[PDB]
Symmetry: D6
Subunit: 170 residues, 12 copies
């Protein structure tokens, strides 16, 4: 019932490593489902002081439940890309939505961003719902933007703005 | 009348430097018109072995006339982004068209890419016309994607595919 | 009720870690409430020989009750910024006031500072109460200095001088 | 009659080194008037990739006339601090006002900042006139912020906002 | 009988170590059968961010039964070399065939490869059997390519293409 | 009328940089025709002590006429791969044949290799003639090994052996 | 009853850290009473091979009792500064005197120094006694040489020479 | 007749080098008259960002005439030491007096120091007179503090305070 | 009864360290009988990627029994030096011979060497036997090639060739 | 009573540490009796590959009884310095004599030295006794070579040659 | 008529480079006639402090005429190897004889070596004669020790001892 | 007629390189006569900050005439070793004696040493005369200390003391 964000810590990397090798999950991020731990580790150390990203762990009643990240934070144009995952066992309990709100909250109320966008698979109508109902609207359809498990996929670019998130939950 | 592409060389940097500090030119690339030469020289050296990009100078009858760049070269998804600049005194001679073709030829016939794409200002009605001619179609309207010169702008994402290009200029 | 300052130690960083991710508390320091433990470590290591700061742990009967720091120590102009935090579980016991005067003592009678200054949220009445009983005057109001949790905030700049401190404490 | 900003280049550094040793001028930036060339040089190199500043040369008809800088560019809070020097022999010809707006134009239309601010000596009424004329409003008086040439000195913090500047210039 | 690929991990290297000193097995990879554990470690560390290879562990009911790898991944020409090994104690159970098709799957449907090729000993009939049932054609015979255990050996170069794989597996 | 091999020196590199950007020539080495001078330069330096290759310049009467290289020199298996370019303006005068035997002489009489091999485009019948004439025999046809100028291309692997070459030349 | 000197070891640093944070004790050395362990540690490693100092631990019957150091050992002018501390619990038992003798002994009989000097607070008549009775005589009174707990203090410079220590205890 | 102080520059080192190898000059600073240029060049580069010192060249009518140095700049205790040299051919023109004043002005009005001090030879009856004129009083007689030219010497420590100086040259 | 070779591992170095300090044993390798562990260790790490040597441990029924190394592996001239030791307690049981055969085997059947040579003490008629009976013949007598336990010793150079080892055991 | 030399090992350094702070013993090596364990470690590490020295532990029935060393090993002039120490608790048992001859053996029959020499305190009669029974002649008396514990000392330089050693020991 | 040896200098490298790429010369040293200048320059810098070798240029009447080298200088066993080259245009004037003598003089009278040795081609009947004259005797016939120019060669190892040389040219 | 010491500068090094290759001269310093310029150069750089030596050039009327050095400057024992060379063409004019006293003056009056010593060849009676004349007394005869030009040689150690030199020269 209670749902929070906290930073991805070094001691959380074992959890990330499992997700990042789950093809069913990684295909949603359009991420190649292959990661040796040492690669993960060496890249997390490399980005410690990278100010263009914030990676979070999602906790549902003190349990690790998924991942939210904000990436490509650009501060002159005031925008970033948003991306999220819920562990397979924590799925279908409302979490994506609750955790997406926390993210946007952080983008708009902490990072002082103007825009948030995301990319989703055209076929992922479940997720597109979540985002339409959150107030994201479609700004692009990228044809064949990704080759995933055997074929080209189309990607939907959705976004939402600061003044609109802020108006809607004030 | 004679127009080629060659790699951007150390000795070309000075010419790039003047362009990179031209607000009216740099607005086309959504690119902050500030650059100290030592920053350009450094980032050029940093990227020497960077396989994800190819930087070219456009030559017209042996004279330097602008710049083409394929960037974000992703070889799993077989795509790249392309950008182009014709220096102010060479504008009005058809060179951009000629350079796009040279660029498309490059990524399609040399790099074995499947998809090329570009980002233009929604208000750039000239260039947007030049690419529809060339086969590109619109795949997104990036809204307020860039803060340029005092206000946010919209960017048109336009793409073309290898099959299109190969089939056509056979 | 024994109260004293000691330097911030490596073995205290986990304690600092919790407070740095505590949004309620970070908001008043005007600090983004996000910190991975590895970021906090690297920075504390980076700063070990920085002579422009002094970070203390506040101890109450030996158990560790908050943080107080003098940063931006400039000895030519002989001034520093003061920041204090009392951990929630230790609030409302007269600790801030006490820690604050230990800090003021330290800056005035060890560092030989002429001027001590601080920045507070205009809405932070309990802190301002505490600073005025300590003797600080308001020198400035900084308009929209910080975007905190959804909106621009106003910052009060308060200060106090060596002769106003030394001529009160014998 | 013609006035421009360009970036501070490596080869402008001997011109900076002269001003930075000129005590009547440096007193207006609250800056100790002592700088070996090799110190300037090393600090310029250290900052080449520092995205928190932008240093410009002021040109008047193709001549080095002065310096304007935005520094402490903080992009979450969307502010920076502004400073300007006009060379003695180029003083009294109107250039401070020009380069100032040129620079404000930059912070507001290019860097997308929300607030620009500045510190002036309480007795430098010329400058204070120029900045008032230009839209800046007083927000603080830092008492005895700087010990300069033999005595403590009071600095006035003045600001301006994007909406104010953009309002007044489109 | 559950069978799957995961990346080669540091904690697997001891397992790799045994196989690399096993002459009977190394002979077919055309690999000198000598490896100190420190050589294997340094090289595995050296290669962590090499994107030209993917090394997998083959798992049978979770217990680790062999190795399969795609090396020389070239994405311009969109090809890679395939090598497989099934540990002795796990041979003759239909594991190679299965692992091999998981690898082919991976190269064809994740890496977006056009061509997969391998090199086998002409005398290695059980491997050639296995490759022909998988669909590979012989493209070359390499005369005296390797000196293995006392004499020059002949290598068969077999290959298979994306459209021959994708148009078999639905 | 006079023909020699000498080593590729640092000061021959601008001559190499021209050929390496000449697309009609580079297509015959299956090599992307794009090379900034600083990339060539850095890669030459990286390989100075690389004992796995030997690069030569072809001289004709004291003039740079072309390039011949042995690479992938593998000494346990006693083989290397051979490649040659003759400059366009020096073509059709018999030099390929000379430098080729000069180079083979080197692999066989100096480096003590057992096998020399080479890749040719299935349609480059000139070269194939030269290599047949010279003793090389076909051993493979790599189908669609290279995507070059717009299409996949077939490469013919040809070899020769020490005993064959030494037989035929003492 | 038995009293010796031994070198300050790494494993003694925890003891030094406590003294170095005791304001009552550090004020006698005119040393700012603030030291994070890591600073102490990083400075002790930095000075391991520094031939201009010798730091000792003072043992009273095998117990850690205080610190003696000889610093600024200059060997052309043949002198060094001497400084000492006795833990508060080991005070008033004769130790300062016994340990000062051991120090001088080391200066004069081991290091072959000509002069030893020390600095003490004008008010520290207890210590001045110890040193007058040891044969040190006053060579300076440095007015306001130190700012300590809230005000300027005068420092007494005392010294003694090799021939005189040696004559006196021979 | 015209006399200023400026920072010691790389290009000044040669002049310093000649002075630093003059026994009759260097005896004034208690300074071994040996220095290879490469040692001076190195120690100069080592100290570039050394905040505890400021080195000046004394100029008389644009010509280099000697050297001033504030060293041991301690900002907690607000003091520094000063030293001065007038090159042999400029002696007898009052320049040292003029340089001390320039130096005192520097540390008192720019550096905000509380106490300046210097060390002279007891036999230097000239200079010792020049500083009593200037306000300095004697605060120690350093006995046999330096071995110079065959015998130990006594040094007079002389000091002046900010209040004295400021009050006097107002 | 069963006898094998395996690579010298890091965890075998303690065993090597004992042999390498046994003067009776080291005198046979003409090696100075003195080795600190850290030297051994630092040299084994230094040579990990040295392709000119292979060091083996000799196991007799799973027990560490001696050392065989092949060194100075030269691949153009196709030869290497061979050297061997049997622990004193494992001596006189046939091991040298069995282990020498394994070595030669590796030289000739794995490393594809043409020649193997060795050096032995003229007096070591026991060992010379082993090698004559293995088919090694004498190619040199190096007079006074080594100073060993108190005097010059003559060394016998023996060798054997690939075709001859191979013929003899086929 | 078994007596032998082994090299000085890292795990012996604590044993060396005690002796290096033992003034009674250090005086005869003319060694300052001060050593922090970290200094001893760094230096032992620094010297690992120094081939100009050999440091031994002296073992008596396996338990470690002293130190013997050959330093300043010069092989052109074929000489070295000899130093020995027997730990107090192990003195007066004929150990020095024995260790000394093991060392002499080592230098003469392993290192192939022509000359061995040592330096002793003129007052060190028991050492001189021991060296004369070993066969060393006095070659020099060094006047006031060392200042040890309060006074200049006189050093005897003794030596012995390969032919005086080898023609005594058979 | 006048002939000396001097050290090989950086400025000599070019001359060495030409020799090192002369097959007919380099065959004498069993040395692959390939060398890029940058490799020679690098290996020269690598060996600057390499005590095991001395490289000389042979000068005849001030003109460079060839090269001598003492390598594998082993000072325990007191031996080295020597090699010599007379450049083609200086051959036939007795210079090699003269250079060997200069070389022998060097290792015997300067380096205190006991044994010098060299390796010649069995077919080099000239030089083999020159060294028998000089005192050298044959101590091995290295069979097929080098693969040169298409076939294996035999090398004659020849040596001379210090006593011989000293006794003779006294 | 005029004679000076100055420091050995970087630009005196070619003059040193000539003497260091002159065998008649170097034999008098017991120094192998072989030195590549780059070795001298690197060793000079390595020693720039080495406080244990001081190297001087001898000038005669503004000309390089020779070299004098103090080395092994040991300041606890207050000694150094002294060496001198006078150039051949500047020999026999009295300069050795001058530069010698100049140098002794330095060790005794500047560096405050207690003892200066020197090694001479037992047959260099010139020098021995000069040093006797000058105050030096014999203290040892090192038998067969150096193998120089073909034979062992005896060195005479001579010293002098500060009190002796200062006595004799004030």
């Amino acid at each position: 019932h209670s749902v929070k964000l906290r930073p991805l810590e070094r001691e959380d990397l074992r959890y990330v490593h499992q997700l990042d090798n789950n093809a069913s999950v990684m295909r949603y991020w359009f991420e190649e489902p292959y990661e040796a731990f040492v690669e993960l580790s060496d890249l997390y150390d490399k980005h410690i002081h990278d100010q263009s990203e914030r990676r979070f762990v999602v906790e549902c009643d003190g349990e690790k439940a998924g991942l939210v990240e904000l990436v490509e934070i650009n501060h002159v144009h005031r925008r970033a890309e948003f991306q999220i995952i819920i562990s397979p066992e924590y799925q279908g309990k409302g979490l994506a939505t609750r955790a997406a709100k926390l993210a946007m909250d952080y983008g708009f109320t902490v990072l002082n961003l103007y825009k948030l966008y995301l990319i989703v698979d055209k076929e992922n109508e479940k997720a597109i719902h979540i985002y339409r109902k959150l107030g994201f609207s479609v700004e692009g359809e990228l044809m064949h933007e990704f080759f995933i498990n055997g074929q080209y996929r189309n990607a939907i670019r959705m976004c939402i703005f600061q003044h609109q998130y802020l108006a809607e939950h004030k």
